[PDB]
């Protein structure tokens, strides 16, 4: 049955990642809600009512990000989600450090180095990061540095049986592991197109649907705890019990 | 009436005439149809009409559509007797007139058909300095102490040195609302001279004038004169030539270029009428207040006339129906493909057919019935009509040499990949000097202009700019492209966005280069040396030698005018959008994501044969089987997530805004996602099994 | 018979292909040898149908074909770019023993170029990138050998040095562009060249920023 529904979740949860970026709680909702009443209308068998949260990742994930410094909000499991599984490098909108400290943590094996494109030094800390397949975070990037095209465009010059990128006269070798996170401060930003086609949008600003949301997890979470682990057992029985029944199988 | 609104409208010019008729006493031109301004005097003392004085001149076949030829006519005479009358004392006068109609080529040939003056042009940037005047005066001219006071002549005798200063209201204002130039050359022409700052002592012009031209100051970027200034210098009005004019013009330049091919000699006049009035109906609709690419200027005609003579050059017996043929097509790649809207698209393709049948009404409609009307000399050996289907095929099998060599994404080709693959490479062929894209972001302007290039054996060269740029690198960069395509035969395509431009330094260096295939502000001491001296080892190369310097200058300017092609970019100047072959490539149209999705997903497993085939769904108009299967459903579905998302982008803007733009980029991420999502999930689960 | 005479044909072409390819690789023109062949594409051509179907006739024209085709690949390789060091790489690599003053078309055309055009385009591009560092070294040693310090007249006293402003830009320019190709991946082999320029350079910004404190602290003090 699971086979026979695959490609209709699998659908739903890569539009949710790809194009529900950058859109409050309500608008991806509503977006969700449109897909699924598509899918409906098309007769594409999809998993009745899914949550993306556990479909996408699975319980220890999302433990890890908690231990991680990560708000519990369901926007913020989402943003988690999308900043995990991307293709096009992140460009965080979070008006509070939250998110910042957030990818910090998460990153600190991999030796995560703070930049931001006002700094003089910004390009020396690119080049040295894009060497040894460090991870890179920018910071204030409405002054957003026109020498990252090539490497927002993912543009590879493999020749000899190795990987190159050009960064202006210079080449560079494009090592592994790369991943560069784009930040920003101001929620209130206008990107270029060209700037907007090349990041996937992680907006983390407070509207009155994410806090109405947070607000009613809270008081489910104080005032009626029964009705709060039914939830969650609700959530779990998609994935994480049958990874556990799996477990206890093996 | 030529100097009181001699710099107005046609209709200012008839209301002063006939104000002065009611006024004065003085005998007039008797005929109440022709308009006084287009009478003159004659030296008997009678009013004598300017048609009259109008030659009729045959250019060659193999001149047609020259970039300075020049076919004399009404307009072009009247202006010329009154840049002699302006010239005899050497008052210096600026042409001001809307772009394309004719006032700096006009100049160029009144200036140089006298033989005892000698012209120099100078083209006036937005950062245009007193500096560059000196520099002109210490390259053509000296100074000389004989005199009362220091003197400044040029070195040739008996030569009057013309500074044509073109865009002269093009330089910026300062702070306080003035411009040096400007000023310097006021103080130049009502004192007659200059302080020159290396001794402080006046130096005095002799044999130097000054002759301006500039497109009005309402358009952008352009400042009007100071009164101090436009005191000195009459201005005319150069207004776009009239049917009158264009139909003589064009019908002489027709028949230069018909006579190739004697077949079709009787079919000049109807063919020029034709285009004529074509061209007034376009010119007519798409104002500059719908879109502002939206102007028309004789620059188009001029490139229609070009085109249809390059398309019949090498072919030989040809009948009405490929005349025919070529004409639609070049109205086609002119006054179609830079249209937005496709009600605006079809009503152009209406108005060609229509316009064909009425001036050609026995012809069979065969030839504006057939739909693709595409040509290519990729298959074959020349430029012929092809079809769709071929075409297609063979592009398909190119594309796959090419991103198996560089650009290893792969492409899918549906019609408008096609159509504007053969538009770009029809700008490349011809020896032109930019093709610019406009689009947006991620469609794929870049990527095609690249494949093209590569099609046709052109280098590609992009500026890499950083935070750190510079006007100096980038007038290097330009400087090399030339000569890697002046000083080379090898040919070069320069491609730039939107975001490689910074500062207006960057632009109308483009500008001057496609109105002319030349920056002369580029080469200087021993750049200008090298430029010399590579151009004598091309020359070596083709097989000339050194000969004159100037003329190696001139041959570096006829191979970048025959050889770059830069083509630059934006997202969606008066002066860039007609200097340019404006083509709109749009955002992917339905039936263009629905192709994407197909190939893109067809390594996907998506065949389930109990699909039951629901009712509604319609987002491809055209899907390809009535019935649709699995596979067809989800990319249906996949576009009409596309298209919620542009719905949802358009409602969010119209209750209070703050969107983000959905690009085709997203669609390729999307689809990406749910191939790499769908192959994860399937995979665990068939481990799992 | 006419299978006689195709066999002669056949040899006439190998004794032709063969003297053609005793030329050396150092005096084998790219361009003549694309005309040559051409030419003999030609002459391969002239024979009637019926000589044409014979199986050698079409082997000849098919690895002639292939000669046409690597051609670009001979274009390539005889260039300023392989010096060499990448000969000695393409020699490793393809295990075969020739010899450099020795070397002949003729070894190059036995093996297969076409198989190989992988490992024969990775040497080119490693011998394209070490040419573009190589050079940028020796333009910064050509700047840094033809540069002399401007000197101006000071009251008929000394000569006080003139364009600090374009001297300073150089350097940094320079100190600038040693970093970046401290960056490059074909850095491995100008490493110390690199060094050793990077340390003059560092050496002359020092030099030079006390001079510039000195002489205007000593026209200051001079006045
Ligand atoms: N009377 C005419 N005689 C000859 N050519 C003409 C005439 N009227 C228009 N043209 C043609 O129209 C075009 C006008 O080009 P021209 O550079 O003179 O325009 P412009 O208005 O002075 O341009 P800009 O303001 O951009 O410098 C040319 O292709 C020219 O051949
Ligand atoms: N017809 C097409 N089919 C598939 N992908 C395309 C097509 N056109 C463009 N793309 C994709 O779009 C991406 C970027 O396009 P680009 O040329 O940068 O657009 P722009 O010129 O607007 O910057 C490329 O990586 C390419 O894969």
């Given at each position: 049955?699971?086979?026979?529904?695959?490609?209709?979740?699998?659908?739903?949860?890569?539009?949710?990642?790809?194009?529900?970026?950058?859109?409050?709680?309500?608008?991806?909702?509503?977006?969700?809600?449109?897909?699924?009443?598509?899918?409906?209308?098309?007769?594409?068998?999809?998993?009745?009512?899914?949550?993306?949260?556990?479909?996408?990742?699975?319980?220890?994930?999302?433990?890890?990000?908690?231990?991680?410094?990560?708000?519990?909000?369901?926007?913020?499991?989402?943003?988690?989600?999308?900043?995990?599984?991307?293709?096009?490098?992140?460009?965080?909108?979070?008006?509070?450090?939250?998110?910042?400290?957030?990818?910090?943590?998460?990153?600190?094996?991999?030796?995560?180095?703070?930049?931001?494109?006002?700094?003089?030094?910004?390009?020396?800390?690119?080049?040295?990061?894009?060497?040894?397949?460090?991870?890179?975070?920018?910071?204030?990037?409405?002054?957003?540095?026109?020498?990252?095209?090539?490497?927002?465009?993912?543009?590879?010059?493999?020749?000899?049986?190795?990987?190159?990128?050009?960064?202006?006269?210079?080449?560079?070798?494009?090592?592994?592991?790369?991943?560069?996170?784009?930040?920003?401060?101001?929620?209130?930003?206008?990107?270029?197109?060209?700037?907007?086609?090349?990041?996937?949008?992680?907006?983390?600003?407070?509207?009155?649907?994410?806090?109405?949301?947070?607000?009613?997890?809270?008081?489910?979470?104080?005032?009626?705890?029964?009705?709060?682990?039914?939830?969650?057992?609700?959530?779990?029985?998609?994935?994480?019990?049958?990874?556990?029944?799996?477990?206890?199988?093996? | 009436?030529?100097?009181?609104?001699g710099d107005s409208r046609?209709?200012?010019?008839?209301?002063?005439?006939?104000?002065?008729?009611?006024?004065?006493?003085?005998?007039?031109?008797?005929?109440?149809?022709?308009?006084?301004?287009?009478?003159?005097?004659?030296?008997?003392?009678?009013?004598?009409?300017?048609?009259?004085?109008?030659?009729?001149?045959?250019?060659?076949?193999?001149?047609?559509?020259?970039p300075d030829?020049v076919?004399?006519?009404?307009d072009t005479?009247?202006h010329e007797?009154l840049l002699?009358?302006w010239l005899?004392?050497h008052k210096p006068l600026v042409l001001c007139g809307p772009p394309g109609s004719g006032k700096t080529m006009t100049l160029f040939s009144a200036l140089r058909?006298?033989?005892?003056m000698e012209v120099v042009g100078l083209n006036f940037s937005s950062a245009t300095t007193p500096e560059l005047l000196l520099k002109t005066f210490d390259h053509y001219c000296?100074?000389?102490?004989?005199?009362?006071?220091?003197?400044?002549?040029?070195?040739?005798?008996?030569?009057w040195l013309v500074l044509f200063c073109d865009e002269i209201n093009l330089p910026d204002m300062d702070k306080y609302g003035t411009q040096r130039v400007i000023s310097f050359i006021r103080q130049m022409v009502e004192?007659?001279?200059f302080?020159?700052?290396?001794?402080?002592?006046?130096?005095?012009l002799?044999?130097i004038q000054f002759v301006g031209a500039c497109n009005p100051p309402t358009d952008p970027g352009r400042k009007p004169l100071s009164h101090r200034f436009l005191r000195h210098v009459p201005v005319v009005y150069v207004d776009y030539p009239?049917?009158?004019?264009?139909?003589?013009?064009?019908?002489?330049?027709?028949?230069?270029?018909?006579?190739?091919?004697?077949?079709?000699?009787?079919?000049?006049?109807?063919?020029?009428?034709?285009?004529?009035?074509?061209?007034?109906?376009?010119?007519?609709?798409?104002?500059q207040?719908?879109?502002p690419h939206y102007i028309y200027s004789p620059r188009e005609?001029t490139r229609?006339?070009?085109?249809?003579?390059?398309?019949?050059?090498?072919?030989?017996?040809?009948?009405?129906?490929?005349?025919?043929?070529?004409?639609?097509?070049?109205?086609?790649?002119?006054?179609?493909?830079?249209?937005?809207?496709?009600?605006?698209?079809?009503?152009?393709?209406?108005?060609?057919?229509?316009?064909?049948?009425?001036?050609?009404?026995?012809?069979?409609?065969?030839?504006?019935?057939?739909?693709?009307?595409?040509?290519?000399?990729?298959?074959?050996?020349?430029?012929?009509?092809?079809?769709?289907?071929?075409?297609?095929?063979?592009?398909?099998?190119?594309?796959?040499?090419?991103?198996?060599?560089?650009?290893?994404?792969?492409?899918?080709?549906?019609?408008?990949?096609?159509?504007?693959?053969?538009?770009?490479?029809?700008?490349?062929?011809?020896?032109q000097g930019h093709?610019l894209?406009?689009?947006?972001?991620?469609?794929?302007?870049?990527?095609?202009?690249?494949?093209?290039?590569?099609?046709?054996?052109?280098?590609?060269?992009?500026?890499?700019?950083?935070?750190?740029?510079?006007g100096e690198?980038f007038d290097?960069?330009l400087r090399?492209?030339l000569?890697?395509?002046?000083?080379?035969?090898?040919?070069?395509?320069f491609?730039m966005?939107e975001?490689?431009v910074l500062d207006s330094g960057f632009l109308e260096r483009m500008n001057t280069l496609l109105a002319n295939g030349e920056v002369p502000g580029l080469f200087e001491?021993?750049?200008?040396?090298?430029?010399?001296?590579?151009?004598?080892?091309?020359?070596?190369?083709?097989?000339?030698?050194?000969?004159?310097?100037?003329?190696?200058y001139?041959?570096?300017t006829?191979?970048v005018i025959?050889?770059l092609?830069v083509?630059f970019?934006m997202?969606?100047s008066p002066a860039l959008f007609n200097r340019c072959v404006l083509?709109?490539?749009?955002?992917?149209?339905?039936?263009?994501?629905?192709?994407?999705?197909?190939?893109?997903?067809?390594?996907?497993?998506?065949?389930?044969?109990?699909?039951?085939?629901?009712?509604?769904?319609?987002?491809?108009?055209?899907?390809?089987?009535?019935?649709?299967?699995?596979?067809?459903?989800?990319?249906?579905?996949?576009?009409?997530?596309?298209?919620?998302?542009?719905?949802?982008?358009?409602?969010?803007?119209?209750?209070?805004?703050?969107?983000?733009?959905?690009?085709?980029?997203?669609?390729?991420?999307?689809?990406?996602?749910?191939?790499?999502?769908?192959?994860?999930?399937?995979?665990?689960?068939?481990?799992?099994? | 018979?006419?299978?006689?005479?195709?066999?002669?044909?056949?040899?006439?072409?190998?004794?032709?292909?063969?003297?053609?390819?005793?030329?050396?690789?150092?005096?084998?023109?790219?361009?003549?040898?694309?005309?040559?062949?051409?030419?003999?594409?030609?002459?391969?051509?002239?024979?009637?149908?019926?000589?044409?179907?014979?199986?050698?006739?079409?082997?000849?024209?098919?690895?002639?074909?292939?000669?046409?085709?690597?051609?670009?690949?001979?274009?390539?390789?005889?260039?300023?770019?392989?010096?060499?060091?990448?000969?000695?790489?393409?020699?490793?690599?393809?295990?075969?023993?020739?010899?450099?003053?020795?070397?002949?078309?003729?070894?190059?055309?036995?093996?297969?170029?076409?198989?190989?055009?992988?490992?024969?385009?990775?040497?080119?591009?490693?011998?394209?990138?070490?040419?573009?560092?190589?050079?940028?070294?020796?333009?910064?040693?050509?700047?840094?050998?033809?540069?002399?310090?401007?000197?101006?007249?000071?009251?008929?006293?000394?000569?006080?040095?003139?364009?600090?402003?374009?001297?300073?830009?150089?350097?940094?320019?320079?100190?600038?562009?040693?970093?970046?190709?401290?960056?490059?991946?074909?850095?491995?082999?100008?490493?110390?060249?690199?060094?050793?320029?990077?340390?003059?350079?560092?050496?002359?910004?020092?030099?030079?920023?006390?001079?510039?404190?000195?002489?205007?602290?000593?026209?200051?003090?001079?006045?």
């Open positions: 049955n699971q086979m026979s529904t695959i490609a209709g979740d699998c659908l739903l949860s890569a539009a949710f990642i790809a194009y529900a970026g950058y859109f409050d709680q309500q608008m991806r909702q509503n977006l969700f809600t449109t897909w699924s009443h598509h899918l409906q209308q098309a007769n594409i068998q999809f998993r009745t009512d899914i949550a993306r949260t556990e479909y996408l990742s699975n319980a220890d994930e999302r433990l890890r990000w908690q231990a991680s410094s990560l708000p519990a909000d369901d926007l913020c499991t989402e943003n988690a989600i999308m900043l995990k599984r991307f293709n096009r490098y992140p460009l965080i909108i979070d008006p509070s450090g939250q998110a910042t400290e957030f990818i910090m943590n998460e990153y600190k094996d991999r030796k995560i180095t703070r930049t931001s494109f006002l700094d003089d030094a910004f390009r020396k800390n690119l080049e040295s990061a894009l060497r040894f397949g460090n991870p890179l975070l920018v910071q204030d990037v409405e002054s957003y540095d026109p020498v990252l095209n090539p490497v927002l465009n993912r543009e590879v010059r493999r020749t000899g049986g190795r990987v190159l990128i050009t960064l202006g006269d210079q080449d560079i070798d494009l090592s592994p592991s790369f991943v560069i996170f784009l930040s920003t401060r101001d929620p209130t930003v206008e990107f270029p197109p060209d700037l907007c086609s090349r990041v996937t949008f992680v907006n983390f600003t407070v509207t009155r649907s994410s806090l109405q949301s947070q607000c009613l997890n809270e008081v489910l979470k104080a005032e009626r705890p029964d009705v709060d682990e039914k939830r969650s057992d609700l959530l779990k029985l998609q994935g994480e019990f049958q990874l556990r029944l799996r477990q206890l199988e093996k | 009436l030529w100097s009181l609104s046609l209709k200012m010019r008839a209301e002063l005439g006939e104000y002065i008729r009611r006024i004065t006493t003085v005998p007039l031109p008797t005929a109440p149809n022709i308009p006084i301004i287009d009478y003159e005097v004659s030296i008997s003392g009678e009013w004598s009409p300017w048609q009259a004085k109008v030659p009729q001149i045959e250019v060659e076949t193999h001149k047609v559509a020259a030829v076919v004399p006519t009404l005479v009247r007797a002699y009358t005899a004392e058909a006298l033989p005892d000296e100074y000389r102490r004989t005199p009362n006071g220091v003197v400044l002549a040029p070195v040739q005798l008996g030569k004192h007659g001279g302080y020159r700052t290396s001794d402080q002592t006046w130096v005095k002799e044999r009239g049917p009158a004019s264009l139909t003589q013009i064009y019908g002489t330049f027709n028949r230069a270029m018909l006579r190739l091919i004697p077949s079709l000699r009787t079919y000049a006049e109807p063919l020029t009428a034709a285009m004529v009035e074509f061209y007034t109906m376009s010119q007519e609709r798409f104002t207040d719908t879109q005609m229609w006339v070009r085109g249809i003579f390059e398309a019949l050059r090498p072919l030989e017996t040809l009948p009405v129906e490929g005349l025919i043929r070529i004409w639609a097509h070049e109205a086609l790649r002119l006054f179609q493909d830079r249209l937005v809207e496709d009600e605006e698209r079809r009503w152009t393709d209406e108005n060609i057919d229509t316009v064909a049948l009425k001036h050609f009404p026995n012809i069979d409609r065969e030839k504006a019935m057939s739909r693709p009307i595409l040509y290519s000399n990729w298959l074959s050996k020349d430029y012929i009509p092809v079809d769709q289907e071929e075409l297609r095929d063979y592009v398909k099998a190119r594309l796959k040499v090419f991103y198996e060599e560089e650009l290893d994404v792969p492409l899918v080709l549906f019609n408008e990949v096609l159509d504007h693959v053969l538009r770009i490479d029809r700008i490349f062929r011809q020896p093709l894209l406009i689009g947006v972001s991620g469609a794929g302007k870049t990527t095609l202009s690249r494949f093209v290039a590569w099609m046709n054996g052109l280098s590609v060269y992009q500026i890499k700019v950083h935070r750190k740029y510079t690198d290097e960069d090399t492209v000569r890697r395509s002046g000083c080379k035969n090898e040919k070069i395509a491609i966005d975001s490689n001491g021993d750049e200008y040396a090298t430029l010399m001296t590579q151009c004598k080892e091309g020359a070596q190369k083709e097989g000339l030698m050194l000969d004159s310097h100037e003329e190696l001139k041959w570096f006829s191979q025959r050889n092609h083509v970019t997202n969606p083509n709109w490539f749009g955002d992917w149209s339905t039936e263009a994501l629905y192709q994407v999705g197909k190939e893109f997903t067809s390594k996907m497993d998506l065949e389930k044969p109990n699909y039951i085939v629901p009712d509604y769904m319609p987002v491809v108009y055209d899907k390809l089987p009535q019935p649709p299967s699995h596979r067809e459903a989800i990319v249906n579905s996949c576009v009409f997530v596309h298209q919620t998302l542009h719905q949802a982008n358009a409602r969010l803007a119209k209750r209070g805004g703050r969107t983000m733009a959905i690009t085709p980029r997203h669609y390729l991420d999307f689809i990406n996602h749910y191939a790499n999502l769908f192959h994860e999930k399937r995979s665990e689960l068939e481990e799992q099994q | 018979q006419d299978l006689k005479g195709v066999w002669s044909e056949l040899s006439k072409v190998w004794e032709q292909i063969d003297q053609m390819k005793e030329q050396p690789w150092v005096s084998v023109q790219p361009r003549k040898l694309r005309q040559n062949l051409d030419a003999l594409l030609n002459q391969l051509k002239s024979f009637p149908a019926r000589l044409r179907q014979y199986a050698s006739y079409e082997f000849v024209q098919r690895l002639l074909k292939g000669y046409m085709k690597i051609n670009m690949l001979v274009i390539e390789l005889k260039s300023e770019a392989l010096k060499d060091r990448h000969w000695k790489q393409l020699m490793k690599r393809l295990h075969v023993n020739w010899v450099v003053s020795e070397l002949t078309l003729g070894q190059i055309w036995d093996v297969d170029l076409q198989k190989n055009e992988a490992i024969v385009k990775d040497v080119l591009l490693v011998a394209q990138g070490e040419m573009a560092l190589e050079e940028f070294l020796k333009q910064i040693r050509e700047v840094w050998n033809t540069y002399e310090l401007d000197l101006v007249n000071y009251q008929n006293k000394c000569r006080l040095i003139r364009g600090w402003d374009d001297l300073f830009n150089k350097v940094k320019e320079h100190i600038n562009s040693v970093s970046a190709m401290k960056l490059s991946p074909y850095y491995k082999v100008f490493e110390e060249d690199a060094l050793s320029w990077e340390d003059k350079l560092n050496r002359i910004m020092a030099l030079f920023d006390v001079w510039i404190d000195v002489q205007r602290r000593w026209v200051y003090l001079e006045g």
